[PDB]
Amino acid sequence: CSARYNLAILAFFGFFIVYALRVNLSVALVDMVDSTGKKYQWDAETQGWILGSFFYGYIITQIPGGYVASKIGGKMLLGFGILGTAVLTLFTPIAADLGVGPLIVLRALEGLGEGVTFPAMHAMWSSWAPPLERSKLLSISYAGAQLGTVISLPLSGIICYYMNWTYVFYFFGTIGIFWFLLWIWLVSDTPQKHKRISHYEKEYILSSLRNQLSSQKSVPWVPILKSLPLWAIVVAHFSYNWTFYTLLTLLPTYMKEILRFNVQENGFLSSLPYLGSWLCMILSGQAADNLRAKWNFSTLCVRRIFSLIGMIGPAVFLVAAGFIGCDYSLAVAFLTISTTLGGFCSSGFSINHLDIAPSYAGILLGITNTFATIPGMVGPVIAKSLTPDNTVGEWQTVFYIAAAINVFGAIFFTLFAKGEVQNWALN
């Protein structure tokens, strides 16, 4: 195809592998711990640390990632982040035998490698994506994350069911390495550095970015963004990610210990939540513009409506799934409905940075992601501290905490967010 669409089809698979390597531990750890592969005697609180150690490195390299990308370009940064994560994943069955310390260190280093991949792709699209086409290209490249989350769970289940849990990490590591080879061979930083680009396509991309590169007055200076219309986005993203990361790391554990599902069924039924979330954030993108064109709705009423939906639907149906516990069908149904409704946040707070202060998208995204990674660090550990064995009441406590946090975040966003370009943002 084209060069920019080849870049978007290789970035799709790169983010597929990023998120697969992130999520495969959630299902492997179900098979790694003891009450065929090797099995370890890790208690409740230890598995919390093993699951949350990824985000301890993930939080570190998201803001430095944009700087290093503007320094050395996005191609090598993204390629080496994913290669580091894949080569480290190849070593998880070895790191688990050395102990818990080396396992959480390995997993935190994987987080370090993965944190630097979204800033790198942003840097690449800054010079590869023409403005009228930026949405389509960015969406194609970042849909790989959703697909990776959706597919890494059934695959991990199938591999753990027909083979050991070690082959999860072997399979995903070798796929990451093969992708790195493809990426290094086929991609370049800039249309000017691409080897197989056409005359007309390069001319078209360059002329599309030509004077918009002149319009970049937001480069040399950034103000003090400590404005409560931004802390609203930060608090909403934190409250969303508490539930998101808690469930992303501990849904296979819940479905094994409470609903009593086989590993294969565990993966297949843990993928439905995120498939629903993907489809819902696809359809909400259209529902939002229909709601903003059919009626005006001020572009902030749209934001707070979609955040209210996507942050109170999850809370309500999470307390519902906790209340109905030990009923496999309704529990899985409600665990699907909650994180399905959680996709309205895609046109809720998730894009309020693109209208509270555009031309600062990278800085504001880095800030909100750095502050919203903390739920990934503390949520799994809290949930494993509250639930020593299963005790459906304990998982009910966990779900009530996550739901209360979602409700608080939705209220805080709907009270304090704004929809206009802020003062300090105008060049």
Residue numbers in the entry: 36 to 70, 97 to 488
Tell me what the authors wrote about this structure, in their words.
Sialin, a member of the solute carrier 17 (SLC17) transporter family, is unique in its ability to transport not only sialic acid using a pH-driven mechanism, but also transport mono and diacidic neurotransmitters, such as glutamate and N-acetylaspartylglutamate (NAAG), into synaptic vesicles via a membrane potential-driven mechanism. Sialin (SLC17A5) belongs to the solute carrier 17 (SLC17) transporter subfamily that includes nine related transmembrane major facility superfamily (MFS) transporters, all of which are dedicated to anion transport, including the vesicular glutamate transporters 1-3 (VGLUT1–3) and a vesicular nucleotide transporter (VNUT). Sialin adopts a classical MFS fold consisting of 12 transmembrane helices (TMs) with two pseudo-symmetric domains: N-domain (TMs 1-6) and C-domain (TMs 7-12). The Sialin structures in both the lumen-open and cytosol-open conformations reveal a solvent-accessible cavity, which forms the substrate translocation pathway, at the center of the interface between the N-domain and C-domain.
The cryo-EM structures of SialinWT in the apo state were determined at 3.2-Å (pH 5.0) and 2.8-Å (pH 7.5) resolution respectively. The overall structure of SialinWT has the same fold with the recently determined cytosol-open structure of human Sialin19, with a root mean square deviation (R.M.S.D.) value of 0.5 Å. In the cytosol-open state, Phe116 on TM2 forms π-π interaction with Tyr306 on TM7 and Gln123 on TM2 interacts with Thr434 on TM11, leading to a collapse of the translocation pathway in the luminal leaflet. The interaction between Tyr335 on TM8 and Leu309 on TM7 ensures that Leu309 is in a certain conformation to interact with Val58 and Ser61 on TM1 to further lock Sialin in the cytosol-open state. Since Arg39 forms a salt bridge with Glu262 and Lys136 binds to the carbonyl of Val248, two Salla disease-causing mutations (Arg39Cys and Lys136Glu) destabilize the cytosolic opening of Sialin.
